[PDB]
From a paper:
Topoisomerase (topo) IV and gyrase are the type II enzymes expressed in bacteria. In each case, the active complex is a tetramer of two topo IV ParC and ParE subunits or gyrase GyrA and GyrB proteins. By contrast, the N-terminal and C-terminal regions of the highly conserved ParE (GyrB) subunits form the ATPase- and Mg2+-binding-TOPRIM domains, respectively.
First, to prevent subunit dissociation and generate a stabilized complex, we engineered a catalytically active fusion protein comprising the full-length ParE and breakage-reunion ParC55 domain. Second, we used an alternative gate-DNA, namely, a 34mer DNA duplex comprising the plasmid V-site, which we have shown is also strongly cleaved by pneumococcal topo IV (Arnoldi ref). Co-crystallization of the fusion protein with a 2.2-fold excess of V-site DNA yielded a crystal structure in space group P42212 with the best resolution of 3.7 Å. By contrast, the second DNA molecule links each of four complexes together within the crystal lattice by binding to the long helices of the C-gate via ParC R468, K464, N461 and H196 residues and is entirely in the linear unbent B-form. The presence of a second DNA-binding site on ParC has not been reported previously, and its unveiling is most likely a consequence of the higher ratio of DNA used in the crystallization conditions. The complex was crystallized in the absence of ATP and reveals novel aspects of the open N-gate conformation. In our structure, the ATP binding site is empty and covered by the neighbouring α-helix from the same ParE monomer, plausibly protecting it from ATP binding before T-segment capture, a feature not previously observed in other crystal structures of the ATPase domains of ParE and GyrB dimers. The link is mobile and poorly ordered, so its exact fold is not evident from the crystallographic data.
Author numbering:
A (entry chain A): 430 to 548, 556 to 559, 561 to 568, 577 to 642, 1003 to 1484
B (entry chain B): 430 to 545, 558 to 567, 577 to 640, 1002 to 1210
C (entry chain B): 1354 to 1484
Write the structure that this text describes.
DNA sequence: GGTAATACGGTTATCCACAG
DNA sequence: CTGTGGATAACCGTATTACC
């Protein structure tokens, strides 16, 4: 039994029949033995101990008859990453112990993902025909459960891999697991449906099919790529939503991170506290995000790349603009959905009162797709969205009057306008990004280059170091000293030169051969209707706009319905201030809460709503009985209800609402450019 | 600047003036240079890194003139484990680099523990608690502790050599008895550069560590039988209504709660405690029911906290009986955000039933488990026989 | 001991605040028709309570209790029922004060609850003893 | 030379795309 | 061959008492 990690190894070792069943635990994900050379492939711990533990040799030196076991069962967890491993491993026994695979000795264990409580297991159709707990991994199952449901011969089911049409198998392991992304992506497009989908043999091709498809789809939709609307990946949305639900906002205390992480992993995000804290930290670093979404107290990283305080230390809390990412989430504005567990519902997208995806950016490594979208200036983005609200048909050159190019939080200089255009047109382009520098004439007569902004996502330490590395290797002459002078109130790298040293030469060699100047490649993929799309500035801005339409609309309906309800109650309270002594003597007349409501409804034609309201009143209320205040309430109610009705009804009314709010956000948060542009 | 690990090393590194200040991160507790073989003290990685960084040579080969720095500043987190590291480092300097401590070159840094304040006498005269330097932002660190203008630094000196070799060798010595004596004696359980003798620094510091590690960690309370971590676990679990009669709950949530609301320490320690509390070959009457992998008598590691769910057991219910009905002393927590009980109602005698074990400083504890029945027998007998002698009691509590 | 005591002091104090409130409630049913009317023109909640006190010798506990009664509860006017509650409360307050005053009733309870726990949870011996 | 249990620290290898 | 960021999985140094 091949098992991932030692915690699953525990459940296995304890559930197993110890006479004829072994367990080999595996640290992590297994090496892709179709993507790396036989060099690394043979120098790999897991691989090696796997060859050993099976004892029959790899490659052409493999003997089916020297094999220590009859069956080689891959029992990974039931989840996505489980499936991906079933893949990687299946593509190692195909590429290196093929006779094992061909002879029908590699099987795949089918443990369950869920379980019921009445107070019945779950492999979607018998969980309905028999009348929850999602298993993170094996180690969440108790040993007897593992045994009776998956490890026991008399009871278990097993999928039995067999190579049926050899050549086709070869083709498939090649598309899916090989080095060239292209055919893998075509395969996904052609096969994966992003909307919405004892012993028993399946072919290598089919098994590899389902498992990779499952991995691919989940990892595209639900991990790596952002939503084209709110611009967030699942983990970031879940962080914002859970923190906000817990009242941890900008206007209150800070709060110890590891509580937050514990909750986020308790309620929304079934993965390591590692990934969660990591994401939460990144959201707090003003040199990674252009507009930060989380404020953190304490060591939260730095441009040198030093580790943030481990999560036991650092206080955190939502920023202010994040609130604007979640405004009106309470007014039924956005699609919710059950979490992994079914304890709670969670949002699938946020209202997003500002256009995040273009402002903060996204990056970006999925499977078959990968995204890279630079940040922009909140002002400029809003300006374009607002022009496009009045001008659906707008062309790129025009919009670029408002959206000239990216605005990195790390400043610098961006060269390449035709390519910024190319990328806003198509989603893909290449641009150059160059550091800010002054030249500094020092005492004596020696010049000194002072770098003061560096390229986006460049490690400052690494850089300074790779420059001193140019010095001591005399890759060019000039550099007398290289010294990081950065501090509390600035970023300053002083490259001091010798007397007589071509400063222009040194500078150019530096831009050429170090990361003082790099390329940014746009690759703007986002999830737009459940499938990945490569998009220019237009489907992004459009998508945004229509989102805000839907949000505003559902909001206006929620408020209007609320309003109506209230109006319909006051309409009762007034017409019961009239027949008061009668209604009191009637509730006193009645017998028990239901007879009182039924009687309030029979004897004076109140509704359920109005009945419950009146009967559920308090005695101290009866003191104040002024119908003029109620009438003012009723009136205001009516005017509101009307303007709501107007927003829901009239289109241009709603688009102006959109623009007013947007211009309000812009006014509040507008910050000046940091990245200068050059053509 | 000697700092305790890379988390605090961050803030150190940032908030520092780079022209003259250096930062050496140490990875944990420093080795005790009194208790260890010279084989070990030789091989110890951090020891070597310090002996090179200070660049002067150890002990007998120590040349004061070759000191790369005028001041060697000790900056540990403000809490107790802090003071204990201060202690270990200090004895190392006393031992294998004496004339540095003799010249007054070894200074101790003074970070604040809380805010709105040092100590606990001046804070009461007025609220976050810095559980390690890594949740202090760099500006704060500079202003409060690293700025040669603003800061305050304890300035360690050997003021009477004879009266020093004793204290170090007693508080750090291999032999326990003299330490225990010292503790029983001195520990009561209930300014730009200030100078202080080694005797008094090592004194007050080891006093702090010892007192905390005895009172609030390693030894159990003679009434509910719990060490504090176990107590916050049962209390918090029960507050969230994570009880025996209601569907297990991802431990990894419970632990975040415990760390943020009650137990300001590393997840590791907390989850490990909760799990041991679920293992029925360690506990005679388990207090936590846990679901999934939670170890074996072979010791295979429990599933990590991401995996297993848990709830209180039924009988833990009784350990918590009537807690709501103002039946037990509460106190504020590390935050001053919430109240936690200081001892539980204990509707059975847990200290004898599940036992305890058992390592602090000067004291260790080993009390083996017993039968819940038999202990309850003896308890009832004693209730009607205040003066009961051991031999009669053993007719109920054989062993 | 300390626990059983303080627990008992808690249970008593609660039973008593209740008792007090129910006696109040009974009296309110007696003079019931003008309670309403006195509130009905009494400026506000505050002056409603003030007017209940400075006119009917009510207590603030009974006052806030009355004036914030739900309207649908003016259905239930059953006096004998509230009187039965009054009975049970009195018996409880008795027992509890007994525990607090008789340092022998208390210890007997202690024994009671301890043996209760024994029947609920006792399991057999496991490590055998040899000398 | 070993382990006991509650504390203090930190670290590494994998997949995925896409760049020079 | 390196780094990007959201995922998988492990790993081990130190203190403290105590006893062969
Ligand atoms: Mg370059
Ligand atoms: Mg690169």
């Amino acid at each position: 039994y091949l098992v991932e990690g030692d915690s699953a190894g525990g459940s296995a070792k304890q559930g197993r029949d110890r006479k004829f069943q072994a367990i080999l635990p595996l640290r992590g994900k297994v090496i892709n033995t179709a993507k790396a050379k036989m060099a690394d492939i043979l120098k790999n711990e897991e691989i090696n101990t796997m060859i050993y533990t099976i004892g029959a040799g790899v490659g052409a030196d493999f003997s089916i008859e020297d094999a220590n076991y009859d069956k080689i069962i891959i029992m990974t967890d039931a989840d996505t990453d489980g499936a991906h491993i079933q893949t990687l491993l299946l593509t190692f026994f195909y590429r290196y112990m093929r006779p094992l695979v061909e002879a029908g000795h590699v099987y795949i264990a089918l443990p369950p993902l869920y379980k019921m409580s009445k107070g019945a297991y779950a492999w979607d159709g018998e969980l309905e025909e028999l009348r929850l707990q999602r298993y993170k991994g094996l180690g969440e199952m108790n040993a007897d459960q593992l045994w009776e449901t998956t490890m026991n011969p008399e009871t278990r089911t097993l999928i039995r891999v067999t190579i049926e049409d050899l050549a086709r198998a070869e083709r498939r392991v090649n598309v899916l697991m090989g080095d060239k992304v292209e055919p893998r992506r075509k395969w996904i497009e052609d096969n994966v449906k992003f909307t919405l989908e004892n012993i028993q043999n399946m072919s290598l091709e089919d098994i590899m099919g389902e498992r990779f498809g499952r991995y691919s789809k989940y990892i595209i939709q639900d991990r790596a790529l952002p939503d084209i609307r709110d611009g967030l990946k699942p983990v970031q949305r879940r962080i914002l939503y859970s923190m906000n639900k817990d009242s941890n906002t900008f206007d209150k205390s800070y709060r110890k991170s590891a509580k937050s992480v514990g909750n986020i992993m308790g309620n929304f995000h079934p993965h390591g506290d590692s990934s969660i804290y990591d994401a939460m930290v990144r959201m707090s670093q003003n040199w990674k995000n252009r507009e930060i979404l989380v404020e953190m107290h304490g060591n939260n990283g730095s441009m040198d790349g030093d580790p943030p305080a481990a999560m036991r230390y650092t206080e955190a809390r939502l920023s202010e603009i994040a609130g604007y990412l979640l405004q009106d989430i309470e007014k039924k504005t956005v699609p919710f959905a059950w979490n992994f567990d079914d304890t709670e519902k969670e949002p699938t997208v946020l209202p997003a009162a500002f256009p995040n995806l273009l402002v903060n950016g996204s990056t970006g490594i999925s499977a078959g797709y990968a995204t890279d979208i630079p940040p922009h200036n909140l002002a400029e983005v809003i300006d374009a969205a607002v022009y496009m609200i009045d001008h659906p048909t707008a062309k790129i050159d025009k919009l670029m009057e408002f959206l000239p190019g990216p605005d990195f939080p790390t400043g610098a200089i961006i060269q390449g306008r035709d390519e910024i255009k190319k990328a806003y047109e198509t989603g893909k382009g290449r641009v150059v990004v160059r550091s800010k520098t002054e030249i500094e004439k020092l005492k004596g007569g020696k010049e000194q280059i002072v770098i003061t902004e560096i390229p986006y996502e460049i490690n400052k330490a690494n850089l300074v170091k790779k420059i001193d590395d140019v010095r001591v290797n005399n890759k060019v002459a000039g550099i007398a000293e290289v010294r990081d002078e950065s501090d509390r109130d600035g970023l300053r790298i002083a490259i001091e030169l010798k007397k007589d040293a071509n400063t222009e030469l040194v500078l150019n060699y530096l831009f050429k051969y170090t990361d003082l100047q790099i390329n940014y490649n746009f690759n703007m993929v986002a999830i737009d209707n459940f499938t990945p799309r490569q998009v220019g500035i237009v489907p992004i801005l459009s998508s945004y706009i229509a989102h805000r339409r839907e949000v505003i609309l559902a909001r206006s309906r929620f408020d209007k319905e609320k309003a109506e309800k209230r109006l319909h109650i006051v309409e009762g309270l007034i017409r019961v201030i009239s027949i008061l002594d009668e209604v009191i003597a009637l509730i006193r007349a009645s017998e028990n809460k239901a007879d009182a409501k039924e009687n309030l409804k029979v004897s004076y034609d109140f509704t359920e709503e109005q009945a419950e309201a009146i009967v559920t009143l308090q005695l101290y209320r009866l003191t104040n009985t002024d119908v003029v205040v109620l009438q003012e309430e009723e009136a205001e109610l009516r005017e509101k209800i009307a303007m709501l009705a107007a927003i829901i009804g009239d289109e241009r009314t709603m688009y102006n609402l959109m623009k007013k709010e947007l211009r309000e956000v812009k006014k509040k948060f507008a910050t000046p450019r940091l990245s200068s542009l050059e053509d | 600047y000697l700092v305790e690990g890379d988390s605090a090393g961050g803030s150190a590194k940032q908030g520092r003036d780079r022209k003259f200040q250096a930062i050496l991160p140490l990875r944990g507790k420093v080795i005790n240079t009194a208790k260890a073989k010279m084989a070990d003290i030789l091989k110890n990685e951090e020891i070597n890194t310090m002996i090179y960084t200070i660049g002067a040579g150890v002990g007998a080969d120590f040349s004061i003139e070759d000191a790369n720095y005028d001041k060697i500043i000790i900056m540990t987190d403000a809490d107790t484990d802090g003071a204990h590291i201060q202690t270990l480092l200090l004895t190392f300097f006393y031992r294998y680099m004496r004339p540095l401590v003799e010249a007054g070159h070894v200074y101790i840094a003074l970070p604040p523990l809380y805010k709105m304040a040092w100590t606990d006498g001046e804070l009461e005269e007025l609220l976050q608690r810095y559980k390690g330097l890594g949740e202090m932002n760099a500006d704060q660190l500079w202003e409060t502790t690293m700025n040669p203008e603003t800061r305050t630094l304890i300035r360690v000196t050997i003021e009477d050599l004879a009266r020093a070799e004793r204290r170090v060798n007693v508080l750090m010595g291999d032999k326990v008895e003299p330490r225990r004596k010292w503790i029983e004696d001195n520990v009561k359980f209930t300014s730009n550069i200030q100078n202080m003798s080694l005797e008094d620094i090592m004194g007050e510091r080891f006093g702090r560590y010892s007192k905390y590690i005895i009172q609030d960690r390693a030894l159990p309370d003679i009434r509910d039988g719990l060490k504090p971590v176990q107590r916050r676990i049962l209390y918090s679990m029960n507050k969230d209504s994570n009880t025996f009669d209601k569907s297990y709950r991802k431990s990894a949530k419970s632990v975040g709660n415990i760390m943020g609301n009650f137990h300001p320490h590393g997840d590791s320690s907390i989850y490990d405690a909760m799990v041991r509390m679920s293992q029925n070959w360690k506990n005679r009457e388990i207090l936590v029911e846990m679901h999934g992998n939670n170890g074996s008598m072979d010791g295979d590691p429990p599933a990590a906290m991401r995996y297993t769910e848990a709830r209180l057991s039924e009988i833990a219910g009784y350990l918590l009986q009537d807690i709501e009905k103002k039946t037990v002393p509460f106190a504020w927590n590390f935050d001053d955000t919430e109240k936690e009980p200081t001892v539980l109602p204990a509707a059975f005698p847990n200290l004898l039933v599940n036992g305890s074990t058992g390592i602090s400083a000067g004291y260790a504890t080993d009390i083996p488990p017993h039968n819940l029945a038999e202990v309850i027998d003896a308890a009832v007998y004693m209730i009607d026989h205040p003066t009961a002698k051991i031999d009669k009691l053993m007719e109920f509590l054989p062993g």
